[PDB]
Design an enzyme around this catalytic site. Structure first.
Site, PDB file in Angstrom:
ATOM      1  N   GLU A  80       0.912  -1.234  -0.001  1.00  0.00           N
ATOM      2  CA  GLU A  80       0.108   0.155  -0.045  1.00  0.00           C
ATOM      3  C   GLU A  80       0.892   1.081  -0.007  1.00  0.00           C
ATOM      4  O   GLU A  80       1.796   1.247   0.587  1.00  0.00           O
ATOM      5  CB  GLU A  80      -0.987   0.102   1.154  1.00  0.00           C
ATOM      6  CG  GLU A  80      -2.059   0.881   0.967  1.00  0.00           C
ATOM      7  CD  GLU A  80      -2.866   0.862  -0.145  1.00  0.00           C
ATOM      8  OE1 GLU A  80      -2.892  -0.494  -0.703  1.00  0.00           O
ATOM      9  OE2 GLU A  80      -3.374   1.742  -0.867  1.00  0.00           O
ATOM     10  N   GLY A  81       0.328   2.242  -0.629  1.00  0.00           N
ATOM     11  CA  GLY A  81       0.956   3.667  -0.736  1.00  0.00           C
ATOM     12  C   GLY A  81       0.341   4.691   0.031  1.00  0.00           C
ATOM     13  O   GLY A  81      -0.827   4.554   0.809  1.00  0.00           O
ATOM     14  N   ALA A  82       0.763   5.914  -0.035  1.00  0.00           N
ATOM     15  CA  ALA A  82      -0.024   7.112   0.519  1.00  0.00           C
ATOM     16  C   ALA A  82      -1.460   7.187  -0.043  1.00  0.00           C
ATOM     17  O   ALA A  82      -2.319   7.428   0.704  1.00  0.00           O
ATOM     18  CB  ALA A  82       0.833   8.179   0.507  1.00  0.00           C
ATOM     19  N   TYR A  83      -1.687   7.058  -1.568  1.00  0.00           N
ATOM     20  CA  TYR A  83      -2.771   7.472  -2.152  1.00  0.00           C
ATOM     21  C   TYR A  83      -3.160   6.148  -3.063  1.00  0.00           C
ATOM     22  O   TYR A  83      -3.853   6.348  -4.032  1.00  0.00           O
ATOM     23  CB  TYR A  83      -2.482   8.678  -3.034  1.00  0.00           C
ATOM     24  CG  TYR A  83      -1.952   9.735  -2.135  1.00  0.00           C
ATOM     25  CD1 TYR A  83      -0.915  10.318  -2.564  1.00  0.00           C
ATOM     26  CD2 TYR A  83      -2.732   9.965  -0.972  1.00  0.00           C
ATOM     27  CE1 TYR A  83      -0.212  11.428  -1.418  1.00  0.00           C
ATOM     28  CE2 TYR A  83      -2.116  11.109  -0.349  1.00  0.00           C
ATOM     29  CZ  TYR A  83      -1.046  11.652  -0.343  1.00  0.00           C
ATOM     30  OH  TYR A  83      -0.291  12.720   0.512  1.00  0.00           O
ATOM     31  N   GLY A  84      -2.600   5.077  -2.919  1.00  0.00           N
ATOM     32  CA  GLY A  84      -3.249   4.054  -3.655  1.00  0.00           C
ATOM     33  C   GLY A  84      -2.037   2.612  -3.583  1.00  0.00           C
ATOM     34  O   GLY A  84      -1.038   2.532  -3.003  1.00  0.00           O
ATOM     35  N   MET A  85      -2.396   1.952  -4.423  1.00  0.00           N
ATOM     36  CA  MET A  85      -1.640   0.834  -4.624  1.00  0.00           C
ATOM     37  C   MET A  85      -0.357   0.513  -5.379  1.00  0.00           C
ATOM     38  O   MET A  85      -0.094   1.479  -6.357  1.00  0.00           O
ATOM     39  CB  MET A  85      -2.394  -0.527  -5.079  1.00  0.00           C
ATOM     40  CG  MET A  85      -2.161  -2.067  -4.943  1.00  0.00           C
ATOM     41  SD  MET A  85      -3.367  -3.015  -5.707  1.00  0.00           S
ATOM     42  CE  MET A  85      -5.008  -2.108  -5.001  1.00  0.00           C
TER      43      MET A  85
ATOM     44  N   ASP B 257      11.836  14.842   4.301  1.00  0.00           N
ATOM     45  CA  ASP B 257      11.246  13.608   4.623  1.00  0.00           C
ATOM     46  C   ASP B 257      12.072  12.603   4.530  1.00  0.00           C
ATOM     47  O   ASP B 257      11.662  11.370   4.138  1.00  0.00           O
ATOM     48  CB  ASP B 257       9.878  13.487   4.353  1.00  0.00           C
ATOM     49  CG  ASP B 257       8.972  12.501   5.177  1.00  0.00           C
ATOM     50  OD1 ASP B 257       9.332  12.391   6.368  1.00  0.00           O
ATOM     51  OD2 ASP B 257       7.982  11.954   4.634  1.00  0.00           O
TER      52      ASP B 257
HETATM   53  C1  LIG Z   1       3.851   4.612  -1.990  1.00  0.00           C
HETATM   54  C2  LIG Z   1       4.367   4.274  -1.262  1.00  0.00           C
HETATM   55  C3  LIG Z   1       5.275   3.597   0.033  1.00  0.00           C
HETATM   56  O1  LIG Z   1       5.048   2.079   0.314  1.00  0.00           O
HETATM   57  C4  LIG Z   1       5.160   1.634  -1.155  1.00  0.00           C
HETATM   58  C5  LIG Z   1       5.444   0.090  -1.135  1.00  0.00           C
HETATM   59  O2  LIG Z   1       5.959   0.458  -2.558  1.00  0.00           O
HETATM   60  C6  LIG Z   1       7.400   0.190  -2.551  1.00  0.00           C
HETATM   61  N1  LIG Z   1       8.019   0.511  -3.733  1.00  0.00           N
HETATM   62  C7  LIG Z   1       7.877   1.949  -4.029  1.00  0.00           C
HETATM   63  N2  LIG Z   1       8.718   2.006  -4.948  1.00  0.00           N
HETATM   64  C8  LIG Z   1       9.203   1.002  -5.439  1.00  0.00           C
HETATM   65  C9  LIG Z   1       9.929   0.779  -6.450  1.00  0.00           C
HETATM   66  N3  LIG Z   1      10.173   1.825  -7.400  1.00  0.00           N
HETATM   67  N4  LIG Z   1      10.350  -0.696  -6.633  1.00  0.00           N
HETATM   68  C10 LIG Z   1       9.864  -1.273  -5.817  1.00  0.00           C
HETATM   69  N5  LIG Z   1       9.156  -1.270  -4.759  1.00  0.00           N
HETATM   70  C11 LIG Z   1       8.804   0.061  -4.684  1.00  0.00           C
HETATM   71  C12 LIG Z   1       7.874   0.499  -1.193  1.00  0.00           C
HETATM   72  O3  LIG Z   1       9.265   0.009  -0.962  1.00  0.00           O
HETATM   73  C13 LIG Z   1       6.588  -0.291  -0.473  1.00  0.00           C
HETATM   74  O4  LIG Z   1       6.850  -1.592  -0.801  1.00  0.00           O
END
Ligand SMILES: C#CCOC[C@H]1O[C@@H](n2cnc3c(N)ncnc32)[C@H](O)[C@@H]1O
Length: 337
Positions: A22-27, A138
């Site tokens: 999951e992320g701040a604003y979606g998958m 950040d």
């Molecule tokens: C949005 C956000 C943060 O959490 C994101 C999930 O995406 C991951 N992630 C974000 N960017 C990448 C990326 N560019 N490659 C692989 N994994 C990623 C992060 O480490 C976590 O597993």
């Protein structure tokens, strides 16, 4: 349209999706880039229902599209609908990274060789960011991505600003957004975080965390954060207090019982002595005495890697939610069709 866990509307260039987190604003998914024949990372961002989400989204896109540096994540592609009315989400495509420093420190002990290499790459990327008169604001382990051969890339500029040191002063206990454990002590006392020294403090916290796999200042609420910092650094000197002109801030510090500094070599008995000398200069209480990024690169701890001709700088220096959506639309136009 392909679905994961939620429509993942990224075809046809990208297929074979796999949920990552999951992320701040979606998958966030990985997906096969049928054009470049490589798996990439794709971030689904649905931000248009809140102004604050649209601010962070526009900041990330705008800065990352302008920056080009080996230690800063790039934006490879942006997917959205052809019109503003049809655009409900935005997909940011980036290089696929194996992990990030946060997940890595959960389970892996770092060798001193890895710590030194990670720190060099962090500071090399930060030299470029600061050269553009930008503050990340950040920096923390989860905003440092790593690939399978430990190449490190700074990500998430959602809180980044142009440096503005003339407007840095504020009153005592002023509210702040960026992640609590990595906040410099002056945030809690008299600073808005509009100077480059705010980022160096965060890098110092990151180095301490690499040495022990535990955040050095895990404050549990706003003011508790400052008291964690003072518990290690000890009481500030008369000279450092006299730089704090705001009386509410200075009188709070004066009210505390005297505390002595905890030696770094007691907190980190297995650490390289040069690593701890640099740590001390990054985690300096007074932001005007704190080491700058280019000085940090030249510190003996990094002598294996230091090469200022191979540490490039930027070529030039760098709202309602309906209006922010318009600017997001325009900023992403270059990736159409
Ligand atoms: C949005 C956000 C943060 O959490 C994101 C999930 O995406 C991951 N992630 C974000 N960017 C990448 C990326 N560019 N490659 C692989 N994994 C990623 C992060 O480490 C976590 O597993």
């Amino acid at each position: 349209p392909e679905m994961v866990r939620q429509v993942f509307d990224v075809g046809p260039r990208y297929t074979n999706l796999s949920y990552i987190g999951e992320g701040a604003y979606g998958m966030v998914c990985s997906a096969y880039d049928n054009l470049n024949k490589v798996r990439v990372a794709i971030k689904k961002i649905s931000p248009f229902e809140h102004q604050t989400y649209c601010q962070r989204t526009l900041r990330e896109i705008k800065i990352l599209l302008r920056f080009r540096h080996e230690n800063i994540i790039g934006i490879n592609d942006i997917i959205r609908a052809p019109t503003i009315e049809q655009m409900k989400d935005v997909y940011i495509v980036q290089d696929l990274m194996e992990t990030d420093l946060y997940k890595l420190l959960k389970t892996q002990h770092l060798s001193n060789d890895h710590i030194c290499y990670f720190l060099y790459q962090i500071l090399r990327g930060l030299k470029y960011i600061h050269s553009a008169n930008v503050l990340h604001r950040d920096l923390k382990p989860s905003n440092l991505l790593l690939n399978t051969t430990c190449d490190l890339k700074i990500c998430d500029f959602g809180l980044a600003r142009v440096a503005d040191p003339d407007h840095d002063h504020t009153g005592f206990l002023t509210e702040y957004v960026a992640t609590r454990w990595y906040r410099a002590p002056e945030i809690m006392l008299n600073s808005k975080g509009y100077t480059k020294s705010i980022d160096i403090w965060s890098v110092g916290c990151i180095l301490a965390e690499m040495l022990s796999n535990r955040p050095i200042f895990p404050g549990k609420h706003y003011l508790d954060q400052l008291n964690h910092i003072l518990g290690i650094l000890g009481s500030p000197s008369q000279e450092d207090l006299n730089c704090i002109i705001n009386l509410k801030a200075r009188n709070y510090l004066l009210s505390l019982p005297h505390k002595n500094k905890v030696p770094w070599n007691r907190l980190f008995p297995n650490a390289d002595s040069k690593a701890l000398d640099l740590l001390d200069k990054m985690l300096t209480f007074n932001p005007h005495k704190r080491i700058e990024v280019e000085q940090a690169l030249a510190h003996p701890y990094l002598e294996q890697y230091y090469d200022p001709s191979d540490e490039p700088i930027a070529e030039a220096p760098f709202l309602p939610k309906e209006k922010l959506k318009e600017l997001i639309f325009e900023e992403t136009a270059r990736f159409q069709p």
